[model samples]
Target: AVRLVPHRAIYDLTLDRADEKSGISGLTGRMVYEFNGSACEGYTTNFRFVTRVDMDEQPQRVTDQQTTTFEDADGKDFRFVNKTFVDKELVKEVRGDAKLEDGKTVVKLSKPKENTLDLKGTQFPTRHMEELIGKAEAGQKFYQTTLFDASEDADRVVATTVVVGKQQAVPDDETKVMGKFSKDQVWPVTIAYFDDKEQQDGMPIYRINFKLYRNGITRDMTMDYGDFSMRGKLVKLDIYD
Candidate 1:
């Protein structure tokens, strides 16, 4: 069985790039996330991303995204809650549970309204990561997958294209947060996410590039959101026993 080292991590976010359409800008923020669980049971992820965006025409605006997700060991069931705040004002909130069976995915919503829908079959978050690590270890370079994490939304499954670089030994003094886990092998990886319902024959909705450790730890993140990009520096990490 693949081993996932449960841990908490903090990332400092800064503007990497922004186009003119995104407006003149300075971006700064912080993100903290944690996942804990065991193979015998299930896993849970608690994540929050906050950013302050400065635009050419207006004062700085703050965007906060907080979400939590749980997936069973067999990846057949999943639950998620998502909230987005603008300047401390709740802009949107969504809660849902999903089940995969008979080559279809059925979702039930609890927030915003009572609803049910049948969507495309897709892998949950934890299962996606596990498969990535497994393929990386097997020397696979590229793959495509569909996932539903309620990250951006739950209306449809997001398509993803993954690129896995060669595994390399950790370099001395390269990562400060790695601490005791500095000696672990790392794989350079990038995943591009596309929203099929919105854009077709267009660029990815978002792109995330990072270095991934064998036990599922990731650092040095570059997140691109079309008009703007942000880089994340890992400042802290705590691995559980």
Candidate 2:
């Protein structure tokens, strides 16, 4: 069995490394993710990411992304708002809601344009998390699934490859915040998300690695974007009842 705990986490981000091919000289950022709710009320997440990047003599570029998402307990309803800014100028914004209708998911977009689409087998974010946790607990190493990540601009459902690593102890620094649960085992997991229309041999649009807790909490993450990679270390954590 798996439990989805309500918690808030703050991560300090640093440029773990960058490939010369990417032309990114440096990168730094911070991220905050707040997860709240329960099986009865559904789940909500407030997320924000801010970063500054240096690209070869160009003025340091700064970007900020703020997103909020909600998922119904039945995994059939979802809502999302994503706003992005560059150098303090709004660059893009996406807002939408989706629900199950006639055995297919219908999405209604209100930003950029009004549109609707019917898609099948699209799992909402929270539902996807539950699936991953279930697989991890079952000692599964790899699995594939489709996700409707309402966060993206295109309102696309992506094909995902999930790899769950062996269980391990929490890091020393995290023990204090993790308290007595520090010794509890956690699985190292990595998920690669591919654009539905893109071939797997090309490149995945996004790749994420994290230490996933049995209660559905995650920490110590790395987000890889092919060109550059950023590491997130757990800086603050709070649990709610």
Candidate 3:
């Protein structure tokens, strides 16, 4: 089984760049991710994202997203809750539980009206990470897969393309936050996510790039959402014994 170090990480985000087509201006944010547990006991993650966006000709908007997820050791059971607030007003929330049944995954939602889905060929977050890291360690550079995402409203499955680069040293400035973990090897990973229902012809709905350490800590991230992009730099880290 793969070993993932338990830790808490803080990222300072800033606007990387925005295409004129995006019709947006400035961006700033912070994100905190707390991951714990092991393969024997399963894994749990708490994540929070807060960003304020200044648009081309519009008032700035503040968006907050908080998410918690748990995946069982065997990857057969998973639970998730995600909430989004715009300008401090709750606009969306999704909570759900999922379990593997026979050869399919079943999801039962509890918010924004009850619903269910029997998904096929989709892996949960933790399992997906495990496979990604595993492949990277094996010297593989690229792969494709499908995912059942519970992050945003828990309503859709998406297809993903992953590109892994060779391992390298952590940046000197980033090492300040990484501390002892700075010595670890990390790969440059990029993932592009496309809506599953649509043909793979249009631009990706979302794309992300990050330096991923063997222990599962990710840093120096860039998130692109077609219209705009943001860069996240590791600002703090706390490791558990």
Candidate 4:
């Protein structure tokens, strides 16, 4: 293993349930990433990302319509629209109020703006996810201490530093590369701790653990919320460009 300097890149991402035990069929999508290794140009340097998503198990073939944009590395903005099909007809459409600050992205659908809607399928908030990549590029500890959701204390999205942990192996099955050559498993993991705005204890609400690869070309991420974890991997690459 070598302590290599981070570089910049973009990638295609695929996500699945880590708890799965079979063909690894669960949820999947695509993403892009950029890690310049410094906090310049108003961007974060440590993050991964995704764009579109599809869940094969769903009968409705429902998919997420997301548009994400980045203001910089530490700050990102996004909007989401959900299309649910009933008998191949568009039956439901849901939009949400969400933003990416420090390094965490929160997408909630509702008029109240207080209720953060939870999703249980393949979903993508493109812009927010991009900011996720930016955060991974920035210092996870920096976003952790500065950008983490400090809504309770500051009432605005605040960033915080969280030494989540380290990862030894990140399997890149899509590229079929393993060992030292595979960009997966070779990432630096860190996190941004968000405050629980609704919880009574006011504990660290959401803990997002991020790992980067390809010298910032690809991103692998996991988020833990006590009960379950959301694992995401985004690779930045070229397609005959």
lDDT of 4 by residue, 43-103 (tens): 2333323333333464423242222222333334333333344444554454454565434
Give the C-alpha miss distance for residue 69 in model 4, angstroms: 3.5
Displacement of the residue 69 alpha carbon in candidate 2, Å: 1.1
lDDT of 1 at 105: 90
Give the alpha carbon lDDT tens digit for every residue of 39-125 in model 1: 787998999999999887898899999999899988999999999999999999999999999888998988878899899988898
Whole-model lDDT per candidate: 0.88, 0.84, 0.88, 0.40
Off by over 4 Å in 3: none
Q: After superposition, how far is residue 207 of candidate 3 from its true place, in Å?
A: 0.9
What TM-score quantifies how close candidate 4 is to the native fold?
A: 0.41
TM-score, each model? 0.95, 0.94, 0.95, 0.41
lDDT of 3 by residue, 25-111 (tens): 888999999999888889999999999898979999999999999999988888999899999999999999888778787889998
Report the Cα lDDT for residue 22, model 1. Answer: 84
- Between prediction 1 and prediction 2, the one with superior lDDT is 1
| Candidate 1 structure lDDT | 0.88
Compared with the true structure, what per-residue lDDT tens digits does model 2 show for residues 146-232? 888876674667889999989998466765676655677889999998886766576898899999888887788999988789998
